Amino acid sequence: SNECIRKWLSCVDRKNDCCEGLECYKRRHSFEVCVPIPGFCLVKWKQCDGRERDCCAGLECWKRSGNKSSVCAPIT
């Protein structure tokens, strides 16, 4: 398991490997970096660890052990 680029660090390296919910920005002269996407969220098949409050509307940090890592799920 490897880590991802830190927010507001440097996108020049790799934009496709910035981070979760991050995207490359466009600047005039100043070096552009990864930024938080507006309205960004998660699905019922995405990890919830760390983003227990980032998932989409209706989703929640689902605690599943034995099959896979901690993922998100819709209201119950």
- Token pair belonging to 7: 């927010």
Phi, psi of 16 (to 5 degrees): -75, -15
* DSSP characters over the chain: ----PPTTS-SSS-STTS-TTEEE---SSSPP-EEEPTT----TTSB-TT-TTTS-TTEEEE---SSSS-EEEE--
Under DSSP, the state recorded for 18 is S
Angle, CA 35 vertex, CA 22 and CA 19 arms, to 5°: 30
Task: State the residue range of the domain holding 46.
Answer: 1-76
User: How many domains is the chain built from?
Assistant: 1
Angstrom distance (rounded) from CA 70 to CA 8: 27
Angstrom distance (rounded) from CA 4 to CA 21: 11
- For CA atoms 69, 53, 3, 40, the dihedral sign is positive
Which residue in 76, 72, 75 sits closest to 44, CA to CA? Answer: 72
- Token pair belonging to 29: 């002269």
- Token pair belonging to 39: 């309205």
Q: How was this structure determined?
A: NMR
